[PDB]
Amino acid sequence: FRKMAFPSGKVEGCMVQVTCGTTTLNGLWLDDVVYCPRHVICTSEDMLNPNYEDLLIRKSNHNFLVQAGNVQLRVIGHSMQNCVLKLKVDTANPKTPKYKFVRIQPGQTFSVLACYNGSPSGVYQCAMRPNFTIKGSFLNGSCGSVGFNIDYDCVSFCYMHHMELPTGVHAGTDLEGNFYGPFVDRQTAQAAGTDTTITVNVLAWLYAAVINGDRWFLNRFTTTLNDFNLVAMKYNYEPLTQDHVDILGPLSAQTGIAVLDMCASLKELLQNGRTILGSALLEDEFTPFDVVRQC
Amino acid sequence: FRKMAFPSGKVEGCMVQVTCGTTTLNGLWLDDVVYCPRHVICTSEDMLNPNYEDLLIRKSNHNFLVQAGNVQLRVIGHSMQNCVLKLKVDTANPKTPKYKFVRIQPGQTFSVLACYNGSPSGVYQCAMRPNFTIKGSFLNGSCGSVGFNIDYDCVSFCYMHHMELPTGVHAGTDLEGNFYGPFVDRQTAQAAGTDTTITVNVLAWLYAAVINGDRWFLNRFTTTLNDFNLVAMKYNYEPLTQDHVDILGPLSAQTGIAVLDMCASLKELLQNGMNGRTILGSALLEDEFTPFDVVRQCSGV
Ligand SMILES: *C(=O)[C@H](C[C@@H]1CCNC1=O)NC(=O)[C@H](CC(C)C)NC(=O)OC[C@@H]1C[C@H]1c1ccccc1
Ligand SMILES: *C(=O)[C@H](C[C@@H]1CCNC1=O)NC(=O)[C@H](CC(C)C)NC(=O)OC[C@@H]1C[C@H]1c1ccccc1
């Protein structure tokens, strides 16, 4: 059992290089539109507190250089939607997949195709935290990298990268330019809330382990929802609902471990602390969906 | 800092489905050849101890169903090379990347494109353990999935998946059909040796942590290759050579922390544990990043 990204070929086809002044970053070319963070129009000074409306007024279509390999695309329109720029280009991406824009929920996962200069460097899987940050690997030039899931041949884009916070975690927008969490695209110190642990994911992981041999944490003891949720309240785990139980229903079936048998194992691991799938810590960034896909 | 696979696009376009009998697995289609594990030609009873020569003799081209997307590729020939089967096909993959076949060294890493029925489902990063196994995620039907690196525009194919060992680790071959390690493609309990921890990679990871702000484990001490190696041997860490030191040179230069200083820090961590702290978020020492891995990621190649 491994943390696993989606095959990223479908997204690589959409990545382009967008340049404006001395600023360059990555764009998402879908049909005849390139999506990219709006702070591409910003200079050094401007970054501390830009007026994007006024700054955009100062830029014409020709100030934007969209590059797809050894091919320049002509920009012919531009519009600001929230924190993203939509540049209309004269050419439609032949490699446009079937795609949709979604806004995922915290606790959901997606893959990230980290890019630089419109070229992909690597791929990894992230979770959206309850405080609407992600733990990534992004350097300067990586803005415009996107997060996505693949259901069938449909690419669901859900994230576009804009910034690092002083803690070193990351923040960005959906593809309509709306930030996840309270953040603004300005170079100021910004706090994320206190985080918490995605209980439903820890359970699915404990299922993943069982399915893959690790079984030492199981026990004869059992527990109720209301009982488990006092323990969880104390260790800063999200409370478990009947909706979460039902979500875990399918892994319960494959294993014959009732959800609340597994919650008993988790109460005990929480109160008393070997390894589980070779981790010394409880992993909370696999969803039930992820666990079922990989088993 | 993250465990990060190469982008897999160039490889997805080479994955096909190969079926022979009730047995389906994945093949790698490059130019006009499809490469896959040879046990695709086995049934149930054959698995326990097959004579692959005899079994391949009794099979013909029409016995191999190769599907690529929604297109059926006509097989027009079949040879065996070591533990892999080469199926010549009527059409050449128009999506054949520039590629090479390499046999990687233990301690080196590579990306795995996990596939089922010729369809990619996922991608992750692995190391060739010193005992020539890999800790992967492989189910039935995943055989023929490949591991690879990208250097330049060239895909270097280094691994093709064959089997799971009793302990749960995985074993396979290079793309010429030679297994990494002492393993055979037969349904029998098979031992890998005792595994060791890849010391030069652990050091590479400690550099990655310093680069990313995690510094509590640095100390003012230093050591010698010889004095460190006597500790390494005790905790089943590969011994460090002057070659490993020079490989770590570039990361030494960027952090201005001397290799043997970091070895002093590793020494302390092994003898004292992590005292409850973490490092790059981990409660254990990671050994599946090469120095090359850390540099590619901490500089954006
Ligand atoms: C993409 O253009 C880039 C990616 C950043 C680069 C460093 N790591 C990353 O993920 N984005 C930016 O540089 C941001 C542009 C603004 C928001 C329009 N700015 C940014 O990320 O600044 C880094 C964090 C804010 C600074 C900070 C730390 C500690 C105390 C105060 C401020
Ligand atoms: C790919 O077709 C498949 C992938 C395996 C299946 C389960 N997990 C995997 O990675 N390969 C095979 O099934 C192998 C074909 C043989 C070599 C002809 N066989 C295999 O993987 O056996 C599973 C483990 C070895 C058996 C075992 C355990 C304990 C004691 C004795 C034997």
From Swiss-Prot, chain A:
Coiled coil: none annotated. Residues 1-295 are cytoplasmic. Cleaves the C-terminus of replicase polyprotein at 11 sites. Recognizes substrates containing the core sequence [ILMVF]-Q-|-[SGACN]. Cleaves and inactivates human TRMT1, preventing tRNA guanine(26)-dimethylation of tRNAs. May cleave human NLRP1 in lung epithelial cells, thereby activating the NLRP1 inflammasome pathway. May cleave human GSDMD, triggering alternative GSDME-mediated epithelial cell death upon activation of the NLRP1 inflammasome, which may enhance the release interleukins 1B, 6, 16 and 18. Also able to bind an ADP-ribose-1''-phosphate (ADRP). Changing residue 187 to A: Does not affect ability to cleave and inactivate human TRMT1. The gene is rep. Residues 1-295 form the Peptidase C30 domain. It comes from the Viruses. The active site is at 39 (for 3cl-pro activity), 143 (nucleophile). The chain holds residues 3266 to 3563 of 7096 of the full protein. Inhibited by pyridone-containing alpha-ketoamides compounds 13a and 13b. In turn, alpha-ketoamide 13b (tert-butyl (1-((S)-1-(((S)-4-(benzylamino)-3,4-dioxo-1-((S)-2-oxopyrrolidin-3-yl)butan-2-yl)amino)-3-cyclopropyl-1-oxopropan-2-yl)-2-oxo-1,2-dihydropyridin-3-yl)carbamate) inhibits SARS-CoV-2 replication in human lung cells. Inhibited ex vivo by michael acceptor inhibitor N3. Inhibited ex vivo by compound 11a and 11b. This is 3C-like proteinase nsp5. There is a cross-link at residues 3, 88 (Glycyl lysine isopeptide (Lys-Gly) (interchain with G-Cter in ubiquitin)). It comes from Severe acute respiratory syndrome coronavirus 2. It catalyses: TSAVLQ-|-SGFRK-NH2 and SGVTFQ-|-GKFKK the two peptides corresponding to the two self-cleavage sites of the SARS 3C-like proteinase are the two most reactive peptide substrates. The enzyme exhibits a strong preference for substrates containing Gln at P1 position and Leu at P2 position. It is found in: Host cytoplasm; Host Golgi apparatus; Host nucleus. Changing residue 130 to H: In strain: Omicron/BA.1, Omicron/BA.2, Omicron/BA.2.12.1, Omicron/BA.2.75, Omicron/BA.4, Omicron/BA.5, Omicron/BQ.1.1, Omicron/XBB.1.5, Omicron/EG.5.1.
